[PDB]
């Protein structure tokens, strides 16, 4: 993405931005899954009727991962749009 924002580069015109954009999205997607997967598991932990309030505290880190992952995704999206615009300009 850094090489694709003008340079000094790339020398992969646009194409690079599209690739970079997907990678950020995938990165975000992976992050969303990992956080969720980890999260899903703890909530189920039946223990067992008078908890969950109660029970534990949870995330925590999750929250951050919940925010960080989201942020990452957003960034990826932005990158993708940038590449798209670049592509448009070339055409």
């Amino acid at each position: 993405g850094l090489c694709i924002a003008a340079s000094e580069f790339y020398k992969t015109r646009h194409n690079i931005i599209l690739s970079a954009g997907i990678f950020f999205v995938s990165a975000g997607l992976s992050n969303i899954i990992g956080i969720i997967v980890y999260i899903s598991a703890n909530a189920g932990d039946p223990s067992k009727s008078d908890s969950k309030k109660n029970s534990y505290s949870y995330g925590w880190s999750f929250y951050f991962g919940a925010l960080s992952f989201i942020i990452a995704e957003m960034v990826g999206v932005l990158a993708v749009h940038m590449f798209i615009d670049r592509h448009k300009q070339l055409t």
């Binding site: 999206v77 749009h81 940038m82 798209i84 615009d85 670049r86 448009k88």
Partner: peptide
Amino acid sequence: TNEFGIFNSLWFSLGAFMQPRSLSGRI
């Protein structure tokens, strides 16, 4: 090109806010 991505992101967000044959985005 940057605004063209904003107008589209708002269009896909409208295609998101729920309700041709480009097989890719079709499925």
